[PDB]
Amino acid sequence: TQRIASHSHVKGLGLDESGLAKQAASGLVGQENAREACGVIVELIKSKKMAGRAVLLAGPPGTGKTALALAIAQELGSKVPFCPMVGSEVYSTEIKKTEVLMENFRRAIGLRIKETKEVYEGEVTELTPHVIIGLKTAKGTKQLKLDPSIFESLQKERVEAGDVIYIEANSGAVKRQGRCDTYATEFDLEAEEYVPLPKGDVHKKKEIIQDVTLHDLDVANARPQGGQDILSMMGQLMKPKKTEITDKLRGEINKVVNKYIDQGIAELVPGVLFVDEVHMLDIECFTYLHRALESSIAPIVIFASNRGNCVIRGTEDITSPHGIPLDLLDRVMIIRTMLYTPQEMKQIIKIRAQTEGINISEEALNHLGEIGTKTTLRYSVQLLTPANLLAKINGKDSIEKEHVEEISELFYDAKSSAKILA
Amino acid sequence: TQRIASHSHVKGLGLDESGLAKQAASGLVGQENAREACGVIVELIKSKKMAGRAVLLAGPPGTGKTALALAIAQELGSKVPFCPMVGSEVYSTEIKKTEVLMENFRRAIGLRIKETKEVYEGEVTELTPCETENPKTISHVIIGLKTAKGTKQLKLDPSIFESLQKERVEAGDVIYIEANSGAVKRQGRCDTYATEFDLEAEEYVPLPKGDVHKKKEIIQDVTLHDLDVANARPQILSMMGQLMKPKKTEITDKLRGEINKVVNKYIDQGIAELVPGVLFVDEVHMLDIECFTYLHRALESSIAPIVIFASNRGNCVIRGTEDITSPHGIPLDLLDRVMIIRTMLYTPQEMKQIIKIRAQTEGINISEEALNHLGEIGTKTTLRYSVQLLTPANLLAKINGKDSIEKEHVEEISELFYDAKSSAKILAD
Amino acid sequence: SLQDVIDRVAFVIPPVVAAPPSLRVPRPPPLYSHRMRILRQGLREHAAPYFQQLRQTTAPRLLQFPELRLVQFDSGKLEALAILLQKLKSEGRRVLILSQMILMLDILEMFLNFHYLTYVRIDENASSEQRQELM
Amino acid sequence: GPIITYHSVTVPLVGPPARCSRTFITFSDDAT
Amino acid sequence: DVTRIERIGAHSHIRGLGLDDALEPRQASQGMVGQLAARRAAGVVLEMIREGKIAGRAVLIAGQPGTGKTAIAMGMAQALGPDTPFTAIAGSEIFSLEMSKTEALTQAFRRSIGVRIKEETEIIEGEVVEIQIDRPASKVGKLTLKTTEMETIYDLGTKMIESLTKDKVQAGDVITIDKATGKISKLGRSFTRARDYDAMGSQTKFVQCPDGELQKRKEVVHTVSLHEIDVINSRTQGFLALFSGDTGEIKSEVREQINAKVAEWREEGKAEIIPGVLFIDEVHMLDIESFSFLNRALESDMAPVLIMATNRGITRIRGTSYQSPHGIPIDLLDRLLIVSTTPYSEKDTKQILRIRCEEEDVEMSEDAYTVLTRIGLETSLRYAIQLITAASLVCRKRKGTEVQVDDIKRVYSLFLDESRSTQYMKEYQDAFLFN
Amino acid sequence: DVTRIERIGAHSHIRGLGLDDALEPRQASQGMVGQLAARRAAGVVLEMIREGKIAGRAVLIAGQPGTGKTAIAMGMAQALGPDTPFTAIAGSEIFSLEMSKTEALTQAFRRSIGVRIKEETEIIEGEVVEIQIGKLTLKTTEMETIYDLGTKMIESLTKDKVQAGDVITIDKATGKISKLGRSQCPDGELQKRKEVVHTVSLHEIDVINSRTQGFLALFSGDTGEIKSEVREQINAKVAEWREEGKAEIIPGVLFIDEVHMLDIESFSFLNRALESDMAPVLIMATNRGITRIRGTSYQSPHGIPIDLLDRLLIVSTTPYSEKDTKQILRIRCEEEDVEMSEDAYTVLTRIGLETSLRYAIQLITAASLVCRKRKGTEVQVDDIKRVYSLFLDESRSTQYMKEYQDAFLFNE
Amino acid sequence: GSSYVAGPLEYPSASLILKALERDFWKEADLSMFDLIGLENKITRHEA
Ligand SMILES: Nc1ncnc2c1ncn2[C@@H]1O[C@H](COP(=O)(O)OP(=O)(O)OP(O)(O)=S)[C@@H](O)[C@H]1O
Ligand SMILES: Nc1ncnc2c1ncn2[C@@H]1O[C@H](COP(=O)(O)OP(=O)(O)OP(O)(O)=S)[C@@H](O)[C@H]1O
Ligand SMILES: Nc1ncnc2c1ncn2[C@@H]1O[C@H](COP(=O)(O)OP(=O)(O)OP(O)(O)=S)[C@@H](O)[C@H]1O
Ligand SMILES: Nc1ncnc2c1ncn2[C@@H]1O[C@H](COP(=O)(O)OP(=O)(O)OP(O)(O)=S)[C@@H](O)[C@H]1O
Ligand SMILES: [Mg+2]
Ligand SMILES: [Mg+2]
Ligand SMILES: [Mg+2]
Numbered sequence A: 001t002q003r004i005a006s007h008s009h010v011k012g013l014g015l016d017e018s019g020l021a022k023q024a025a026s027g028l029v030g031q032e033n034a035r036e037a038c039g040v041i042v043e044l045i046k047s048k049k050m051a052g053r054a055v056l057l058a059g060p061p062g063t064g065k066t067a068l069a070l071a072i073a074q075e076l077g078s079k080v081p082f083c084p085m086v087g088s089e090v091y092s093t094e095i096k097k098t099e100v101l102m103e104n105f106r107r108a109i110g111l112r113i114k115e116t117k118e119v120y121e122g123e124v125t126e127l128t129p130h131v132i133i134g135l136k137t138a139k140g141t142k143q144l145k146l147d148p149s150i151f152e153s154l155q156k157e158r159v160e161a162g163d164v165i166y167i168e169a170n171s172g173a174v175k176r177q178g179r180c181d182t183y184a185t186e187f188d189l190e191a192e193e194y195v196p197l198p199k200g201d202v203h204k205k206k207e208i209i210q211d212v213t214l215h216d217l218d219v220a221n222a223r224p225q226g227g228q229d230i231l232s233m234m235g236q237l238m239k240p241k242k243t244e245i246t247d248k249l250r251g252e253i254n255k256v257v258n259k260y261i262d263q264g265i266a267e268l269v270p271g272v273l274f275v276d277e278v279h280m281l282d283i284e285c286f287t288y289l290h291r292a293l294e295s296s297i298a299p300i301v302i303f304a305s306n307r308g309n310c311v312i313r314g315t316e317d318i319t320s321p322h323g324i325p326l327d328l329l330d331r332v333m334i335i336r337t338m339l340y341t342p343q344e345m346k347q348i349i350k351i352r353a354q355t356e357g358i359n360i361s362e363e364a365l366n367h368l369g370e371i372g373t374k375t376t377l378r379y380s381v382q383l384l385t386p387a388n389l390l391a392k393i394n395g396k397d398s399i400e401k402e403h404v405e406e407i408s409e410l411f412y413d414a415k416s417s418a419k420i421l422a
Numbered sequence B: 001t002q003r004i005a006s007h008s009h010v011k012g013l014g015l016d017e018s019g020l021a022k023q024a025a026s027g028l029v030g031q032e033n034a035r036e037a038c039g040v041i042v043e044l045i046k047s048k049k050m051a052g053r054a055v056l057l058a059g060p061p062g063t064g065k066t067a068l069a070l071a072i073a074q075e076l077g078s079k080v081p082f083c084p085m086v087g088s089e090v091y092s093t094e095i096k097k098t099e100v101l102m103e104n105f106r107r108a109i110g111l112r113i114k115e116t117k118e119v120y121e122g123e124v125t126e127l128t129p130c131e132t133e134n135p136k137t138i139s140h141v142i143i144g145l146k147t148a149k150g151t152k153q154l155k156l157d158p159s160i161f162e163s164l165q166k167e168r169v170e171a172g173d174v175i176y177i178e179a180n181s182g183a184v185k186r187q188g189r190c191d192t193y194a195t196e197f198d199l200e201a202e203e204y205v206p207l208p209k210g211d212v213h214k215k216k217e218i219i220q221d222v223t224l225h226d227l228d229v230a231n232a233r234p235q236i237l238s239m240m241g242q243l244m245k246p247k248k249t250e251i252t253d254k255l256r257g258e259i260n261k262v263v264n265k266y267i268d269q270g271i272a273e274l275v276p277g278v279l280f281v282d283e284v285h286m287l288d289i290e291c292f293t294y295l296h297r298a299l300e301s302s303i304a305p306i307v308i309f310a311s312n313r314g315n316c317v318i319r320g321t322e323d324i325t326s327p328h329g330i331p332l333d334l335l336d337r338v339m340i341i342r343t344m345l346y347t348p349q350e351m352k353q354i355i356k357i358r359a360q361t362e363g364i365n366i367s368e369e370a371l372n373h374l375g376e377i378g379t380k381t382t383l384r385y386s387v388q389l390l391t392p393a394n395l396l397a398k399i400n401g402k403d404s405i406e407k408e409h410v411e412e413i414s415e416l417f418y419d420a421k422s423s424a425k426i427l428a429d
Numbered sequence C: 001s002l003q004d005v006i007d008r009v010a011f012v013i014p015p016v017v018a019a020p021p022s023l024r025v026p027r028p029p030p031l032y033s034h035r036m037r038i039l040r041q042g043l044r045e046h047a048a049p050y051f052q053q054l055r056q057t058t059a060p061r062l063l064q065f066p067e068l069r070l071v072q073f074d075s076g077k078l079e080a081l082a083i084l085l086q087k088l089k090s091e092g093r094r095v096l097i098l099s100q101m102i103l104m105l106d107i108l109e110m111f112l113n114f115h116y117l118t119y120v121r122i123d124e125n126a127s128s129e130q131r132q133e134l135m
Numbered sequence D: 001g002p003i004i005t006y007h008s009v010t011v012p013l014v015g016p017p018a019r020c021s022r023t024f025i026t027f028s029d030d031a032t
Numbered sequence E: 001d002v003t004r005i006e007r008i009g010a011h012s013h014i015r016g017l018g019l020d021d022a023l024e025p026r027q028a029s030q031g032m033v034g035q036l037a038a039r040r041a042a043g044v045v046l047e048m049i050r051e052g053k054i055a056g057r058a059v060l061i062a063g064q065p066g067t068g069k070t071a072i073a074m075g076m077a078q079a080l081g082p083d084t085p086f087t088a089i090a091g092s093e094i095f096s097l098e099m100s101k102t103e104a105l106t107q108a109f110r111r112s113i114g115v116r117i118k119e120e121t122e123i124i125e126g127e128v129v130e131i132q133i134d135r136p137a138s139k140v141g142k143l144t145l146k147t148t149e150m151e152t153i154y155d156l157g158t159k160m161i162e163s164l165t166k167d168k169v170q171a172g173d174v175i176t177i178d179k180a181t182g183k184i185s186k187l188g189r190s191f192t193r194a195r196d197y198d199a200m201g202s203q204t205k206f207v208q209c210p211d212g213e214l215q216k217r218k219e220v221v222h223t224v225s226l227h228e229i230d231v232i233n234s235r236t237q238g239f240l241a242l243f244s245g246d247t248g249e250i251k252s253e254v255r256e257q258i259n260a261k262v263a264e265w266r267e268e269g270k271a272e273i274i275p276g277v278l279f280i281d282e283v284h285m286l287d288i289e290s291f292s293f294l295n296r297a298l299e300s301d302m303a304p305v306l307i308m309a310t311n312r313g314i315t316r317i318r319g320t321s322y323q324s325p326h327g328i329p330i331d332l333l334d335r336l337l338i339v340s341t342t343p344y345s346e347k348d349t350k351q352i353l354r355i356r357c358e359e360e361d362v363e364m365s366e367d368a369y370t371v372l373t374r375i376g377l378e379t380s381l382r383y384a385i386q387l388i389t390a391a392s393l394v395c396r397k398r399k400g401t402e403v404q405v406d407d408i409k410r411v412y413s414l415f416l417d418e419s420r421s422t423q424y425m426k427e428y429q430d431a432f433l434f435n
Numbered sequence F: 001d002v003t004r005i006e007r008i009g010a011h012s013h014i015r016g017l018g019l020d021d022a023l024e025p026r027q028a029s030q031g032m033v034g035q036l037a038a039r040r041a042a043g044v045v046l047e048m049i050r051e052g053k054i055a056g057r058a059v060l061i062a063g064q065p066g067t068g069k070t071a072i073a074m075g076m077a078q079a080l081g082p083d084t085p086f087t088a089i090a091g092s093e094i095f096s097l098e099m100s101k102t103e104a105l106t107q108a109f110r111r112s113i114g115v116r117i118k119e120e121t122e123i124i125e126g127e128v129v130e131i132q133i134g135k136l137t138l139k140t141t142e143m144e145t146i147y148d149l150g151t152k153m154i155e156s157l158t159k160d161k162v163q164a165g166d167v168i169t170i171d172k173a174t175g176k177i178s179k180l181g182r183s184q185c186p187d188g189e190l191q192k193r194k195e196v197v198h199t200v201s202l203h204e205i206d207v208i209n210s211r212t213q214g215f216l217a218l219f220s221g222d223t224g225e226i227k228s229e230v231r232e233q234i235n236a237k238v239a240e241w242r243e244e245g246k247a248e249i250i251p252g253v254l255f256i257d258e259v260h261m262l263d264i265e266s267f268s269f270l271n272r273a274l275e276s277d278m279a280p281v282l283i284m285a286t287n288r289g290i291t292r293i294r295g296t297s298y299q300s301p302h303g304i305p306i307d308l309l310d311r312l313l314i315v316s317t318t319p320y321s322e323k324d325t326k327q328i329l330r331i332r333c334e335e336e337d338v339e340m341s342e343d344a345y346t347v348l349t350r351i352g353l354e355t356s357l358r359y360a361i362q363l364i365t366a367a368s369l370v371c372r373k374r375k376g377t378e379v380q381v382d383d384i385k386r387v388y389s390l391f392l393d394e395s396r397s398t399q400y401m402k403e404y405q406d407a408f409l410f411n412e
Numbered sequence G: 001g002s003s004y005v006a007g008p009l010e011y012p013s014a015s016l017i018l019k020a021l022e023r024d025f026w027k028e029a030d031l032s033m034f035d036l037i038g039l040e041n042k043i044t045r046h047e048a
């Protein structure tokens, strides 16, 4: 079974057909107003019409901001790009902060390009030095003339006659994958591996659909790895490093992708950028986000913040309602997440127990909920697996109240530790 | 060696067989308790049992903390690796501070490699194959080798015929053949066939002396840091690497563990013997909080060397903190991991003894009254200052045609040069 | 020393590949063209003694085929057949494998190569005499 | 054509049984 | 006897957590003394690690200085064994000039997840009894192997002949041939070369003859971290950076590809995830940006169990102006369980000193144990521990066999603790710099 | 052709400045509403740019947040011909880890001056009839010709396999042969003379001439601090081209949005950069009142030092009225293909005046989605109230943050 | 699974852009008289 994370139980938003939030569905409990707003946000993302619309999930810690963002990701599906990031990731040592933000903006736009892959495959018969090589398959044999670059690739693979090779003419890549199974009996022992002859035609064209971000195209065109020529090869020896991709390159990639969409050989899938802790950005990043969010190419961007009225990073004494400057709060829609009632906390704990494969009795669940009315919800949830381990060690297959009490005696919460220190 | 430095007179801790400190011996005067504690530290180092033990030399400026550390270095000898550092060196531009610290930790662990090679070297005198019937077939290839001592014939395996022709060995060539691999190496024509009329350089070598068959022992001294650097970046990728600047790299713990494994295998095989030594960190108060915290983990390693810190800062704010003052500039957590040796101020008599020993080491003749005057100058001012007056006063004396410093020379040099306190007085006025 | 462990883990292919951008001009200058030509000539002359090293140490990993071990893994029939053929090979017996259709013989003989059990194939594509000749 | 045979066999030691290995390089023709 | 690379360090006496089957700590077992509640909690966390089903569980060990936090961490590591990865860093190690702090934490998290690959290999194993190679001057050859149960003569292809020549295979060599790639490894010789051959200066021991069939179906287990997979896939010469640490910020797309393929390899039978532990000692050296990164990084399915230690009370978070418990933001403290360590008593301190004397191999009298326990309670545990070693050296200087009270008093006089050194610094404060 | 890369952004509805030939601003034209004075001033600046005679002219657009300053800049970009360069950067983008602030500012300046060079070339395009190796026969639908081949042309035709029936085009001066298929055959003349006109910015010339294959730095970045000698010599060569008539200079616009993020060093650099004859027209925007210049403790009227403020003319933008807010809402609704009832327009105008204009614009899309969910066709007041309840403005969110202040972290 | 392969981004420009910095040889002196580092692979101080 896959490992259980903090948000594994979240399968979606749990909205009905009319888009009202059910009290307990799809992992989420309560938070109806925020769930309905995230529903409207999901519709906004699915419409693919608006660029650069930003939303901020703002609320106290433990109120489901990241759960709601991941629920949006679940409702969208795997087809729609979703780029989770943290504001503290912008402090690269390699590229400037604005470039990191822009690269995340470009990651969140996806592109399905249908590409025709043509392949020459077979067992080599002749390797006459441009080269007139021959390939033989289960059907027949053909003679082909290829660029000297393909011959140099064959020499790189050290292909000898009688070997089964795979040539992708699009990328000029050759894969020698074995010696033909016909030769597999000639010697009682040889170091090579044998593989059957190919079953199709020598020259085969297959149509495939490739999923890429705009960021992939940008980085591929910025640092080319496909030159297969002396100068590009000498450049490839250099240590890899992120570079500040220019606006000219991105404009060219935009034009190429527009041509692809016009030809019908590609479809563009606007996705989401998610910045989980936006208050770790500084004033330079927020100022850049002004221009970035006003762009017509930008994705739908989601922010989450748990700070009160605190000081904006990169400034001296400027305080703002969430640590985000007032100029950027004007450009975002705000979704508020509220604190939980005890009953909602108990429902969340029960869901977490069922997700963690843990059986818990009603009395133990009630004591855990009472502990969670103190301390925090996350503390109370985190006591499930220690208590189930102590149950298993004591030979019980369910958490009892005594096991919860003992685990709460072994492990203290933040408030208790602060009281001890103070 | 030949030039005289501020510690060139320190020849070791002047301790007796009982571990007690003599009043003045081996170039050190006073500091008896500190010298005895340093001697116990030397015994700790020579025991080789312990790892990561820390000692702090602490006391006023010019109380011999660096002299005591270099005295420990003299006592341990040249076999034990002694790595000096100053705390300012961690702030590199190529690598992070904790990497600098770990690199200096591994520089203080020595390893001594022992290689025993068996070699058959000589001038080639015959290469006759030994034909046979197979049960042309050859069963041996006979090589005759000549040295100044004599001549030997070897009955080599026939497969060595490939290496002989690969090396293009002929009669009159000096070669050597290693016992283990059996591969031949050619090292030139014997110089007995060189004329003054023919021009070649690399292709001639003198006829070997000694017996034809030789057993050679090669002993090499390395540090674990040397092995780290060697395995981190071995010497077309080489062309680009040598054209580009070879910066320091943040060597991973994976490589350090692999090298620990290899060195333990060598120590088990008997090829190598470890010599763990000392890392000396002077001006340690120049380290910042990140360095001190890292040192918490670094000193708790079972592989760490013994480290000697020195500080004079007194109750001072820790660098990289704000307003966190500490008893030595060294956080109390790190101070709990070090044994502290205090160093104390010198009496006028001890200062006079040090001045005399310095004059002796500098090769300076000093008169008795000049010595008394310079001692009293050093009871004012500082000891360091009074020592610094010796050679300029000697030069002034040499100008006046005197082979020894007279008091008037000390007075005149004192009137020319001023100390830190007198200069602060001039600045205040 | 990790070479064996490295090849088992080298699998990431880049999502996009592109040749370097080409600067296009009408009427390229004779001096610029001559300088580029001599630069390329010198680089290729110096690369020639080390060309296979440059080629292997620069060529990118573009293709990713499914490992032949999955051709067994995909079906339990091939797993039990692997068990049976390994056991029977340990007893010196030979085997005839009968299957319904041509493609299954293709994937079977791929599997038989992955087990290093060399085979011979006759099926409807053979002429009348070649069926008996290979038998 | 000319052939050089590298041959290495077990041979019994003289003053499983005591054995050693021995090598018998062989050449086809006197010219080579 | 011989001086190994590993010597007696500060925690060499820790062999484990010293627990029974019910995770009830023993008073003195496996080098652990006292800390009953903390050791029971560490046992529960170690069971949580060994089950491996829950990702991103964080535990912070908080207590006074010298109360055994690094001790409990080393006990957990020792009881974990080498199979499960255990990455221990100081919190100051993440501040790098090669990479961002978030990249450093990412690499640390991904060093703590093993991927255990399995593959089956065709292996030939036997002693060479005859080899013939004929070359023009293509190569034709014949190789005979024996393995007690059988003796097979093989006709050799050109590539196998080249491999055998490169290995310089001779009759009487016990060799291994990997039929998948032709790699030839020599395990040892079975008997001497001919006594008639000069040079050949060796008399190596001869390994026993192989047994069973020549060709066997051998399964081999290879374990690599995620960070290794990351580095190897990052560039053409990536593996060289696994040792040198010359790794720039790895692209997030590469890590997403590796996560996806590893997830497939664990839906197949090809690989198994071994999730381990990241131990960040002195975690208060992390700044707010690192803590914020830790918040999100703990919510991944590939996150290991994060263990943290700090002795700071309510102090200022680095990079900020706010004071929080342990120097950690409250939102990350919400993500973890806190384990508290208690100061030791006379009996526990004495037992710790006894265990340290045993590991340092120091014979010491019972009066010496009493005076050293009093000193350790008065000054510190670590100071008394270091006085064990010094008092041993002083006793050996006087040719004594057992460290007595006089040796302990002498080393107490020579080497100062923080308090007496502070008093002497204050008594001579005008000589020290900047008061 | 579905879901192009260009989507509906914040300033997509702006298609120009909406001015007459007298630069009189129309109340609603090309998506602009109101800001009549500031649009008139933008038009005067636009005429200054189009003339291009004066160098180093700087204009500052100042006003309250949301008053349409970036919108005015976008309108000026749209009205300005695509031939003339318009570099638009935020002030935080000059803090590069690969180049100094002055170097990034210089690159931005030099990107904003274009050099227009015209050259002719001769192009041969036709269908191959016979090739002999040499002689080459080409035909179009109107003419056929036979060519006598040279050694280099023979090599070019040998390297790129050309046979009878192929349709190819050849650059006569270089022998560049590209095959475009096999045979529609071209109709007209086989050999044609074509003028081609490239506009290359000074930055591009700099980077191309900086190193061998330097044009790769035009895409990936990787441009270090370009040497000053290279720039001076390129300026001299460009002046020589202007004197000889082989090039024309097309001065453009550099727009620095939110310029208050620049520091004192950058401002001091701008003080002298705008005094060169190759300086473009610089436009800046800032909502800051009197506030500290970054990198200093000095408060200054826009966060901009008075040295730079003396080199520029300031354009102020007013608040919007009820009529202008309603018109902006109408134009945004048309841009997004959202139909709203008149009562909904009034309510959204009231919300926008009370809270913010951007908030009302966002509520447009939110209410449209809510209306689509209930199978509606026109956004009603009930939808506006729904989305007003679902989504908070900054004022209301702040009030709730005050209501539950004890639950937030580091609240002050 | 295989990568997408894009065609190269062709980058048009005028010929004059490459002719920049090209000065006529009647305004280039034999500056090699000031070339120092070029002598290290050529001559030696004793040879000088
Ligand atoms: N409504 C909910 N229903 C079910 N589980 C929830 C709900 N809200 C939160 N959780 C879970 O409880 C925990 C709370 O974590 P988060 O949702 O990330 O809180 P948060 O808003 O992100 O707080 P911060 O700002 O990151 S400290 C996670 O394990 C969630 O999966
Ligand atoms: N006891 C001593 N015997 C002989 N020479 C001494 C003695 N103490 C100090 N010296 C010498 O006098 C000088 C001062 O001693 P140092 O070791 O430099 O003092 P220090 O403690 O290192 O001062 P700080 O803290 O580095 S400023 C050096 O040249 C020493 O060699
Ligand atoms: N319960 C224990 N049993 C045995 N040895 C212990 C115990 N607790 C601490 N020690 C030893 O005492 C010494 C002090 O190390 P620790 O107490 O683990 O470090 P610490 O408690 O984390 O103090 P800080 O916070 O790092 S300054 C080490 O040599 C430990 O091995
Ligand atoms: N006169 C106008 N006509 C049409 N749309 C306008 C007008 N003024 C503003 N807008 C639009 O209203 C929205 C907000 O205007 P902005 O131009 O972003 O305000 P701003 O002056 O740039 O405020 P700052 O300083 O950037 S926070 C954008 O979508 C603009 O396109
Ligand atoms: Mg969160
Ligand atoms: Mg000193
Ligand atoms: Mg500790």
Ligand SMILES: [Mg+2]
Pocket (backbone or CB within 6 Å): F069, F070, F071, F285
């Ligand atoms: Mg604006």
